[PDB]
Motif scaffolding. Sequence first.
Motif, PDB file in Angstrom:
ATOM      1  N   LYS C  37       0.820  -1.206   0.000  1.00  0.00           N
ATOM      2  CA  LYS C  37       0.000   0.000   0.000  1.00  0.00           C
ATOM      3  C   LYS C  37       0.858   1.261   0.000  1.00  0.00           C
ATOM      4  CE  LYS C  37      -0.703   1.197   4.846  1.00  0.00           C
ATOM      5  NZ  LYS C  37       0.649   1.798   4.699  1.00  0.00           N
ATOM      6  N   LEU C  38       2.046   1.184  -0.592  1.00  0.00           N
ATOM      7  CA  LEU C  38       2.900   2.358  -0.713  1.00  0.00           C
ATOM      8  C   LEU C  38       2.436   3.314  -1.801  1.00  0.00           C
ATOM      9  CD1 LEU C  38       6.396   0.643  -0.386  1.00  0.00           C
ATOM     10  CD2 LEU C  38       5.306   2.136   1.292  1.00  0.00           C
ATOM     11  N   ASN C  39       1.573   2.855  -2.709  1.00  0.00           N
ATOM     12  CA  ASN C  39       1.203   3.678  -3.856  1.00  0.00           C
ATOM     13  C   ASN C  39       0.302   4.838  -3.451  1.00  0.00           C
ATOM     14  OD1 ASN C  39       1.208   0.558  -5.298  1.00  0.00           O
ATOM     15  ND2 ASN C  39       2.485   2.182  -6.171  1.00  0.00           N
ATOM     16  N   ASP C  40      -0.717   4.572  -2.631  1.00  0.00           N
ATOM     17  CA  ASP C  40      -1.697   5.609  -2.324  1.00  0.00           C
ATOM     18  C   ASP C  40      -1.151   6.621  -1.323  1.00  0.00           C
ATOM     19  OD1 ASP C  40      -1.611   3.957  -0.159  1.00  0.00           O
ATOM     20  OD2 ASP C  40      -3.776   3.641  -0.005  1.00  0.00           O
ATOM     21  N   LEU C  41      -0.349   6.167  -0.361  1.00  0.00           N
ATOM     22  CA  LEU C  41       0.170   7.058   0.671  1.00  0.00           C
ATOM     23  C   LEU C  41       1.183   8.023   0.071  1.00  0.00           C
ATOM     24  CD1 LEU C  41       0.211   7.765   3.717  1.00  0.00           C
ATOM     25  CD2 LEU C  41       2.031   6.074   3.985  1.00  0.00           C
TER      26      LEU C  41
END
Lengths: 49, 49, 50
Positions: C37-41
């Motif tokens: 979930k590194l993409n959205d943050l």
Amino acid sequence: ALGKLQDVVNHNAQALNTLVKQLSSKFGAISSVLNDIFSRLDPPEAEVQ
Amino acid sequence: FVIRGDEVRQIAPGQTGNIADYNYKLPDDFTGCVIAWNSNKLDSKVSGN
Amino acid sequence: VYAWNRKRISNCVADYSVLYNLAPFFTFKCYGVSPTKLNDLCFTNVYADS
């Protein structure tokens, strides 16, 4: 001299204007938009918001 | 089940992550308790588990 | 290793998806943050070494 007839219309229009303007009040919440609170915040306290 | 120490936060209502999305998802309305403790003395291989 | 290199990756949009094709499966182990979930943050600055 027709102030009596004009006053009723003015009062009704102003009351409606205040009522429809009251929607923008935050009431101390995060935002005044429902979908923003539901999507960008978890249920457990969005429910109370 | 067994998970990592850092990612135990995702076992709770409303959070997102690898397990929260793809392995185990709690419902919005939950009535229960969660118990977690370290198991380094049992599930740890020197060679690899 | 004794003389490592540093580059400042700033002012751009990351494309972490491309990193998965490298290696047969991977050696990607990721510490301190959920790997998937590194993409959205969003982050301030990204340093890189090699």
